[PDB]
Amino acid sequence: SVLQVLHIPDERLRKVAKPVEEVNAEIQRIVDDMFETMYAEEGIGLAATQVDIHQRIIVIDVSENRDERLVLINPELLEKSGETGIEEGCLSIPEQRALVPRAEKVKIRALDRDGKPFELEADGLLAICIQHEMDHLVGKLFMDYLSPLKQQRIRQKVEKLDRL
Ligand SMILES: [Zn+2]
């Protein structure tokens, strides 16, 4: 149920996920386990690469009451616009936060948990979270937008924390 979330510097976090070939009962089980992991870790999104599953699967819920489940299988970014940024954290980079430039608005297509295609226009927090999770699927972390020295400071603090 609660899968293991990988933390930097694990090279598995740099792996590029393959597309899901068929949305079947196995894929639906992965989706459900990813939500259970996400909520147990108090996250608002989770990408399959963070749990060592090399498939293009994202789960998101930005709601306070944890009752608004968004599933993005094989997501495609169609359009983006504007610029914004907030202090982002990442379950794979424990206890670190930094402001990251992001598009303010995104338009995406994906498959839902039933395999049905849909299109979503998002802004604000949801748009930011979508970009953060899509980055995970191509081996990209928010710290990659930062300077090399800030990246090394992040890497050493996470390592300190993990060595406990
Ligand atoms: Zn993350």
- Distance, C-alpha 96 to centroid of its chain: 16
CA gap 105, 126 in Å, rounded: 9
How many domains, in total, are found in the chain? Answer: 1
Residue type at 40?
A: A
- Long-range interactions of 29-35: CB distance < 8 A, separation 24+: 30/55, 30/57, 31/57, 31/59, 31/71, 31/73, 31/113, 33/1, 33/2, 33/3, 34/3, 34/59, 35/59, 35/61, 35/69
Assess if residue 4 is contained within a domain.
no
Assess if residue 6 is contained within a domain.
no
Assess if residue 27 is contained within a domain.
yes
In sequence order, the 6+-apart residues with CB closer than 8 A to the CB of 71 are 31, 57, 58, 59, 60, 110, 111, 112, 113
Please say if 133 is a catalytic residue: yes
CATH number of the structural domain spanning residue 113 = 3.90.45.10
Q: Which residues pair with 79 in a beta bridge?
A: 107
Range of the domain at 110: 11-162
Question: Per residue in 54-63, is it b (16+ CB within 10 Å) or e — as a string?
Answer: ebbbbbbbbe
Q: Token digits for 90? A: 């990442």
* Residue 61 φ then ψ, to 5°: -150, 110
Assess if residue 118 is contained within a domain.
yes
CA of 153 to the centre of ligand 1 (A): 18
Please tell me which residue in 36, 83, 133, 159 is annotated as part of the active site: 133
* Residues contributing to the annotated binding site: 90, 132, 136
Q: Resolution (in Å) of the shown entry?
A: 1.4
In the block, residue with structure tokens 């996250």: 43
Q: What is the dihedral of CA 63, 68, 72, 73, to 10 degrees?
A: 140
CA of 144 to the centre of ligand 1 (A): 12
CA gap 53, 32 in Å, rounded: 13
| Spatial CA neighbour of 134 closest among 63, 69, 80 | 80
Element of type H or E holding 30: helix 25-40
Experimental method: X-ray
Contact between residue 158 and residue 8 where contact means Cβ atoms under 8 Å apart:
yes
Assess if residue 5 is contained within a domain.
no
Assess if residue 58 is contained within a domain.
yes
Assess if residue 25 is contained within a domain.
yes
Assess if residue 3 is contained within a domain.
no
Count of CA atoms in the C-beta half-sphere (13 A) of 43? 27
Contact between residue 14 and residue 27 where contact means Cβ atoms under 8 Å apart:
no
CA gap 120, 38 in Å, rounded: 21
